[PDB]
């Protein structure tokens, strides 16, 4: 599938990708922070 789409797009569909050109920028430090819900949230979530 992929190769067909690539060849169809190539004559009209420029790309860059940040890491080729934004060489002077810092990379995004990306955090996922898990949180624990409260007593009031437990009561309602359970009732649902």
């Amino acid at each position: 599938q992929l190769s067909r789409l690539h060849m169809i797009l190539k004559p009209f569909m420029l790309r860059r990708i940040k890491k080729d050109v934004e060489n002077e920028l810092s990379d995004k430090i990306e955090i996922l922070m898990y949180c624990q819900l409260t007593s009031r949230q437990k009561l309602l979530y359970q009732a649902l």
């Binding site: 430090i29 955090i31 996922l32 922070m33 898990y34």
Partner: protein, 447 residues
């Protein structure tokens, strides 16, 4: 990319019946061998299965049951199971039989306070309130001088209104030191006032000030709302006998004085009964009779036993659970007369008795395993078998009591779990009630 978690609030303390979660009966009314934290005692658990229906029926008053059986058999564990089985909303009132000896009020009356506390009531109260920033405040004077009105202008995010109010409310606003620019709340049914602070609009007017500031109230200046209030008959009885509602000097000063208990008279309870029946008739109220649990019943005085003859024959009184662990003792207050469980025959004829009985070695092992995993500790099988033997030699209470001490030794010498050698060490540091009673009998010349 990076992942993080936070939670540091210390979890709830473990205690002597925190493993019990309910009776663990099946739908047919029979008892499962092990469920919801209980094991064994099938006839007594089946009997408690009848009593949780007797409570939820709402039909009855003054029915009473006695849990009886040797120390360490699980009487109060069952009564605590029933308190789980009824759920939170039915009032369950725990009491010990030595609490009747107050220094403020007669024993005969302390019982009545507890009975009236075990009947709950649920009320759909409607409150009407005014709230806003006070933009204007003006009294209107009249002749024999008097105050006829106060005029108050209030402001909220919706707009403004202006109200004419009784001098009682002006007296209250003065007392609360209210001024223009303050945000206030008034409930018109009670006549009560609360100051919240100055409106946020003014919060930058000074470099240095003592006040807290609040955002402008949302919604209409005047509104009425329903609050579902849970209460007991006792709470109505007492709040009328030494009042603190309203806003007069007398009630306001009665909030400062030392709160002595008092013998509420039969005329007040009579008038409160009529009021709550009229709240039920209007469909404003629902009644929820609950349970009174009187542990260690064997040491009420004979004056108190002879009062329960009358209180259990009331058409109002809630369902009562007594508990006792005594043989043919002398009845307190009589000095001469002995009877089963320490209770007079005349009262013992007005109760149904539930027999509770000693555990087998297999049951003790099972309870110890349940309890160890409740206290959060890991135990090896040969250790647990050793504790089982200690149980048969002593008492299951002592056998359970060694668990946490053993776990401390285990972590001190770097083991994750109780090994047999830990239990075998702890058993020699702490004596039990029989082994200590031996050494103290041998050396009886010296104590």
């Amino acid at each position: 990319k990076i992942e993080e978690v936070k939670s540091t609030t210390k979890t709830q303390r473990i205690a002597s019946h925190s493993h019990v979660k309910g009776l663990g009966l099946d739908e047919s009314g029979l008892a499962k061998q092990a469920a919801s934290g209980l094991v064994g005692q099938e006839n007594a658990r089946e009997a408690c299965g009848v009593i949780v229906e007797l409570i939820k029926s709402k039909k009855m008053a003054g029915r009473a049951v006695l849990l009886a059986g040797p120390p360490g058999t699980g009487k109060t564990a069952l009564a605590l199971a029933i308190a789980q089985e009824l759920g939170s909303k039915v009032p369950f009132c725990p009491m010990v039989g030595s609490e009747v000896y107050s220094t403020e009020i007669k024993k005969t009356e302390v019982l009545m306070e507890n009975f009236r506390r075990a009947i709950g009531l649920r009320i759909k109260e409607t409150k009407e309130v005014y709230e806003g920033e006070v933009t204007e405040l003006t009294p209107c004077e009249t002749e024999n001088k008097t105050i006829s009105h106060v005029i108050i202008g209030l402001k909220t995010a919706k707009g403004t209104k202006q109200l004419k109010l009784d001098p009682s409310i002006f007296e209250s606003l003065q007392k609360e030191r209210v001024e223009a620019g303050d945000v206030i709340y008034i409930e018109a049914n009670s006549g009560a006032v609360k100051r919240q602070g100055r409106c946020d609009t003014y919060a930058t007017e000074f470099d240095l000030e003592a006040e807290e500031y609040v955002p402008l109230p949302k919604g209409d200046v005047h509104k009425k709302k329903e609050i579902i209030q849970d209460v007991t008959l006792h709470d109505l009885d007492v709040a009328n006998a030494r009042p603190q509602g309203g806003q007069d000097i007398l009630s306001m000063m009665g909030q400062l004085m030392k709160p002595k208990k008092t013998e509420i008279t039969d005329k007040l309870r009579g008038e409160i009964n009529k009021v709550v029946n009229k709240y039920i008739d209007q469909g404003i109220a629902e009644l929820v009779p609950g349970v009174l649990f009187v542990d260690e019943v064997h040491m009420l005085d004979i004056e108190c036993f002879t009062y329960l003859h009358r209180a259990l024959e009331s058409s109002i009184a809630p369902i009562v659970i007594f508990a006792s662990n005594r043989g043919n003792c002398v009845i307190r207050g009589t000095e001469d007369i002995t009877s089963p469980h320490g209770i007079p025959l005349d009262l013992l004829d007005r109760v149904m008795i539930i027999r509770t009985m000693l555990y087998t070695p297999q049951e003790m092992k099972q309870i110890i395993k349940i309890r160890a995993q409740t206290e959060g500790i890991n135990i090896s099988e040969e250790a647990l078998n050793h504790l089982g033997e200690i149980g048969t030699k002593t008492t299951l209470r002592y056998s359970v009591q060694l668990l946490t001490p053993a776990n401390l030794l285990a972590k001190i010498n770097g083991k994750d779990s109780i090994e047999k050698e830990h239990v075998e060490e702890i058993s020699e540091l702490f004596y039990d009630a029989k082994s200590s009673a031996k050494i103290l009998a041998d050396q009886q010349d010296k104590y």
